[PDB]
Amino acid sequence: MDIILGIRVQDSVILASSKAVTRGISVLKDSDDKTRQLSPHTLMSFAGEAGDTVQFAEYIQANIQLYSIREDYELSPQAVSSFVRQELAKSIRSRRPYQVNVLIGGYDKKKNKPELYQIDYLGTKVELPYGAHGYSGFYTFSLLDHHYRPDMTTEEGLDLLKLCVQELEKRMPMDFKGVIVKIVDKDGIRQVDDF
Amino acid sequence: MDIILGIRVQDSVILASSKAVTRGISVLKDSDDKTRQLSPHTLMSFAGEAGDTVQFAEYIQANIQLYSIREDYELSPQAVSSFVRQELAKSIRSRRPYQVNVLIGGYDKKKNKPELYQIDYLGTKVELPYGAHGYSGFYTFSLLDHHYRPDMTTEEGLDLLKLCVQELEKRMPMDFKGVIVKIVDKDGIRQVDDF
Amino acid sequence: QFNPYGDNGGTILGIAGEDFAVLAGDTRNITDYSINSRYEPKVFDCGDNIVMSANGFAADGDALVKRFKNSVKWYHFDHNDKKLSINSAARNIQHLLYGKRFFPYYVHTIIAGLDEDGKGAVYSFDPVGSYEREQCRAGGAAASLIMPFLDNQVNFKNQYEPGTNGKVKKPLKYLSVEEVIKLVRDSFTSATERHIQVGDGLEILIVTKDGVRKEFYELKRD
Amino acid sequence: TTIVGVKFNNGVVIAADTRSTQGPIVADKNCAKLHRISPKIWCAGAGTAADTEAVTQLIGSNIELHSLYTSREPRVVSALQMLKQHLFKYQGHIGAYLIVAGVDPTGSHLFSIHAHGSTDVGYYLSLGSGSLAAMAVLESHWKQDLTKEEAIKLASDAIQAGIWNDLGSGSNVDVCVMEIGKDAEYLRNYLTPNVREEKQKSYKFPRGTTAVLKESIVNICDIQEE
Amino acid sequence: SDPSSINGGIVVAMTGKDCVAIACDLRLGSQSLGVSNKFEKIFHYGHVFLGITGLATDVTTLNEMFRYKTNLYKLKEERAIEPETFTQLVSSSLYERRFGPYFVGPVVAGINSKSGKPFIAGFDLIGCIDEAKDFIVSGTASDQLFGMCESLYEPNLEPEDLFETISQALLNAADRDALSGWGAVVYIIKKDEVVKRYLKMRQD
Amino acid sequence: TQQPIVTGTSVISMKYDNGVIIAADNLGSYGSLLRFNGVERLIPVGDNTVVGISGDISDMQHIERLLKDLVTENAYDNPLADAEEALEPSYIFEYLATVMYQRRSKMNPLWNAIIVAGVQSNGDQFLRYVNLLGVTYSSPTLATGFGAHMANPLLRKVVDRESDIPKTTVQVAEEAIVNAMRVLYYRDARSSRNFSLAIIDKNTGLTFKKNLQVENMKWDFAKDIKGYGTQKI
Amino acid sequence: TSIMAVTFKDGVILGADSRTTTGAYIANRVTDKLTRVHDKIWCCRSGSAADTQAIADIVQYHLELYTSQYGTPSTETAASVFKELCYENKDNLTAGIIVAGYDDKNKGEVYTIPLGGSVHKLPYAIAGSGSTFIYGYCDKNFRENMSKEETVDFIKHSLSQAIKWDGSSGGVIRMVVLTAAGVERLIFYPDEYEQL
Amino acid sequence: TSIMAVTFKDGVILGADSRTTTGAYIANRVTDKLTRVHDKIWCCRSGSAADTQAIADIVQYHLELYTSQYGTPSTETAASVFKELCYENKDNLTAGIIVAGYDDKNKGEVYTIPLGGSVHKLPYAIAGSGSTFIYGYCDKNFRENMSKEETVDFIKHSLSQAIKWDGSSGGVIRMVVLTAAGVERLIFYPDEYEQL
Amino acid sequence: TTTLAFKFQHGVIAAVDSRASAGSYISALRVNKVIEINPYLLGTMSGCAADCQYWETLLAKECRLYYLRNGERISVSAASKLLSNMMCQYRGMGLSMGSMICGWDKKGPGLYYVDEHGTRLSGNMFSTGSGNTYAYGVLDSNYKWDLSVEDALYLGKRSILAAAHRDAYSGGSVNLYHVTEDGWIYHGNHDVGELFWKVKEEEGSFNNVIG
């Protein structure tokens, strides 16, 4: 798929993901949710080749849910991101690699800190205050570099995110049909229904 | 460029043309007018390869303006469309062809009839009640086939055109930044400033 | 580089009647601009009142028919000599063809017989197994020459009743076996004239409740 | 295509089949492959049909003018030289493969010419997709000092070999005999061994079968007086 | 990509008793997209009729060219061009573009005004003439047309019978071709009257 | 997938009233080089079958060994190995046809064209073709490679259809085959003058003729041919 | 193709086979590859038949026009004209020509002009696809100042072996003898040379 | 490379040049291309040196193991093992091998195994890039039942011409004589064979 | 192909065309592009004929086994997933299969789009095939949740007609289905030739075409 954004503020992580799905010359859907909940306080958005994205995300989801049941314990965002990276690094040298780029937004309940991890299909992991995949960063990173503070509130994070989407909507040739925004904090994961 | 539409109603021809211009991954302009007035009652919209479109249109404009001055007389839309077709048919077998598709909307003052001609870069001319170039017709022709009558008013023509643009905006992957709409009738050429 | 495929030409034709069916095919076998044989049977009686033809690359066609004949033999062994119905044969052939989805049998297959209500039946396949029951089907080299003729003369397409001027169609009256055989012979004579890979001989297999009968007719040898 | 050329006692004979194909489809069942360059110089062409016609008409036109200029009857070597120099210049892009035969004041002549501009001499030749089938007949039955009747037989037998065994060849046999001291006799459809049999049925339709929307008279006449 | 199949279309011509018939479909497309259902492919210069299939820009270009050439012929010769002569003109004009050809499949049809003899002819894109007695076919459904014409045709048909035969050949051939159809026209031609009929057909 | 290296050219054959005839030259070509001049490409199997093979010689020698092994294997626990349960032409062909089609299906073909000629138990003539693609066909006359283009037309003038077989004697059939071999020597650049010929008759059995030569050749007319057009001397 | 030209005491002899192929089909089995450009200057042709015929025709024209103006040309002069055509049009030609001629002053001379358009004057020359198989034989058996009968035997035996091993070569063996006495054509059929 | 094996009255002789090239560079000018697989069964190698060495090593192993179980193998048996390796691995090999050996029963025998893996028993055989130039010479000069000295001269003269014309061939001429008397190695240097 | 399917108040409508092509040649005029998996499950077909038939016929085998093991009909969501999982096995091997799995289960009416990439999408409206753009035009401007069974069936029918007209690789006839909680209901085969002229007159549409 097309655009996925992420931003880590004071006390939460916000992920924004486009709604469009295109096959051939036709937009089949304009309300697609490019994300899976891995655990109560860990959300993963994804983008890449058709089919592979959902299959990979669901496969990761199943593995983390299996870990949660076995140990009666939620893995840290760092642990989950490392697990995901290894799977992608394992995948890139396979017969047919999974062409999937992800952002992992999680709230670490132990450290009481939000955490955002950016991982591409090669298995390239980086922890960031804000991130994106594909061409999204080309348009948005200049705004984020300018406006971002680490002590920002969730509401300020959403406003800076709105500015990023507006810039994308102005200067991108593709119509990505807006974004679904989700917030990850100490209380869990919730969706912003009006954006 | 991307999308150009045309529709011939009772007493006028309406041409709608996208406003976007893209270089690389960036939309450089969202207010571009993809059209040239060939004569007081003849308008030509265009779409194709970068640069060639404007050069071709202006070259046609100059030739028709030269004819108008020499004879103190406005050529019929049919005559202009035939001139344009020959230039494109001449061009397709040149060393480097001009990759330009056009719609010619004109009001014939002699016959008191609106006329719409669709001509592609090969020199393929057809007179139509409504027309388009590229992928535009794939989305819009089903609506036009359903709703079009030959006795439609200009206002009904604009409403049917709005429906076509809405369908394009829904099912096209590309953001073409809306359209500039122009009307060609007995009184000449005017632009609809609110669309 | 080695090319595992080839083209042996030929053309086949199946027509379903009310209580009979015919499967016809020319007897010419070719490669490029040469004739291999003027009489090389292409339509086969496979048992259980079923006739079959796999037209295109003969090697793949012979392999398929051989395998289907074998499937009929084992159907009898495994299911108490039960008769293999034409619909059951068709589905079986689908799986034979799709089993080689990634290295296809390069043939157009057609089978003909009688359904379980005694009515005439023709089934048509593509090289990778997609199939359907049909009333009329020409396959092979001159398939595009013959099919429109059959749309016109078997299903009375674009034919209307005089005087009404396009308001009332020609009614779909059934065809006798004598009438069908005429359309088959005229179809192949016409195909032989305008297609270089069609000629030499015509062999028709007619299926009725009484069994399978054969008719042979000469074609132009040029 | 099957074409042949056979020399005999007092002249030369050429022949050809009458099938023209587009791919595996037969476009024309009675094509005329025997072309005239001059009255007593005839050629037959295989390969690109338009090229064999265009190149034959061009050289035939220049040969006619040459004949008028020199007040002499045209020679086969002139046609040959003019053809090969034209074909060579275009480096095989004009796909004309011809057998050229005729009689002139020098004698009887038989040549073959290929698209790139090479020429050959022989007593018997064959060209086209059916050349091998025809040459098998020629190599089996040709001899020195053939009569006119023997050569026509050999030529038409060689064409028949191509008709029956080559899919690119078929239908009828055309012949042209060029004898010294005589007019050339063109025998169109010399053999007709491939007549289509009567159809089992007539497909003449009832009048009114086809649906019609509009009828109109077409004005083919010029603008009228009064 | 293939110029001869971008726009689609078909033309067929037949001879009858003291008459000829030429017919064509009306479709113009851009590959899968149907663009026009009024793109007629038959033109006439005096009493000589010409049908052209193939790349539509060349169809239009050639019509304009032969109109040009037959108009000059008429002014100089002081008479209308005959079918036999026009056939050679078409052949000449196509071969002059031997190494940059018009991607077309022309078909000539007409009756010699002096001899009264019915005449048809076909060409390839490069000029080779096919002078058949029976019928000529051209277009994206040429295979289909060969099959229909070969089976339906019989010699010495009367004008009104010939109409049914050519119409049924065209219609059923077009209905087995994705790139042909969207309407059809049939010209019935006699020595001094020509009738033009638009056929009703399926519009898919 | 391979390419053929050392190759044998045409194999030609036909049916006649009481049996079948088959022939093939003794050349093993290495491209345009006429490298090996003593190669036998007709291989008898018992006294009722001759397999003629064209194409890659290394694959021919492999097939030769398969047939030799087939005879050995048939004799095992078979008291009627030289009588009712002897190898038939139809058994030998079907075996080869199975092998050829299997090998092409593994994309590793035996690069050959094969004609199995013989006479069955009931006296019936057997003549069938198979090649590297597993394609099979039967005809009153059969030929491979150039033979298909030049021999078949000549042989079909003798036996044009099935009904001409009883009317064709062994003398007429052999004559047609020998003439065909001469024509191939005139016109096939990868042919040799030396060839072998085999006759399998239902009465007289298997006659295998070695060291045959093309004779009665016409070359004299060459002396008169001068230049390529205008040259007189 | 198998072609050769050999100088001897009384002049020079040209030799060639008669086979022309289109792949493995023998398009002409009685070809005349020994072509005359002047009375006593002949050439042997190898490579593209279209190219070699077109060249030899042009050379014959040049030497005919030379003769009209300046008298009988030398064999060296003929070779130079061949060379000039082959060299300047090397990109569009595939021609391997042997030039052989007799003067009274220079006697028998042989020039070979391979693919690139270079010229090489030699006692004898061999060319064509079949020449590869007789380099060893010809080197061991050639002598200078042989007799006419010895030279004919040398060419016959040599081309015999070339024909024997090269499938692109065959048919009859044609020869042309160039001496003060005049121009003699010879021919040798398969039954004669195969049994050598 | 220029290699050959010739049968004569008392047995068989193998001959070869000594040049190995990497393009136009002579990587080794004193190569030993005559290789032993058994006491009196030797082979001449042409093609990929890696492939031919690997094959000959495997054959030597098979015949050593054959000998341990069944006694002295025939020359035919040796050739079959070469063939089996060359034929079954034809896709991955580029080997042209001549096999030559002496029995007391069968005397001198020569088998050639070209690229495809076919086997051909012959009176004499030639192979390698330089063999093309001596097909004519060798055919004209070979006789059956020659003497040892006649056979050595035949091989010497033949390879001399192959070396003379083939740039891929050169150096010394090595030979191996296989008779009832035993195994004799010979060598002939440039100054000897060039002047022939 | 052109196929479509959409959810509405009274279930789901499914409509497909009936053409089959082999280049410019129209290979079949009346192929059945809908499969009756069970009395409450339908599957549309677009792409490789062969593929579509094999894998959706196999889906029906697998959906039948679900009923035997669980004693309960399979959901539309689960059925669509089984199919999407079959596609993921032959991932990249060159299959071509676009389909809508339509039906009625415990959650009400269901509709899932599935393609050869293993894509599985839930939604109220879908259209696949070479002519899907033409169908979407009519659907988008006329669709409502409040449609009547009669008006909905007509919309699906008219939408295919639009595509059959313009798309060269769509046509032949229209097959209609209506899925209810008592099962699917076939609403017949409708020739496009006859339907076009009928719709032209009654609706007044296709003014540009002459009839």
Ligand SMILES: *[C@@]([C])([C][O])[C@](*)(=O)[C]([C]C1=[C][C]=[C][C]=[C]1)[N]C(=O)[C]([C]C1=[C][N]C2=C1[C]=[C][C]=[C]2)[N]C(=O)[C]([C])[N]C(=O)C1=C([C])C2=C([C]1)[C]=[C][C]=[C]2
């Ligand atoms: C549209 C017509 C556009 O193709 C539609 O997609 C149909 C779908 C369809 C589904 C089920 C049954 C029939 C048709 N597609 C086709 O017709 C495809 C198009 C196609 C060709 N190559 C290709 C295609 C699609 C995707 C990749 C590659 N056509 C076919 O698959 C051809 C091979 N089918 C036939 O020729 C058939 C014949 C003949 C035949 C069939 C199919 C079924 C029953 C009897 C005969």
Ligand SMILES: [Mg+2]
């Ligand atoms: Mg990264």
Ligand SMILES: [Mg+2]
């Ligand atoms: Mg024929």
Ligand SMILES: [Mg+2]
């Ligand atoms: Mg359509």
Ligand SMILES: [Mg+2]
């Ligand atoms: Mg050296």
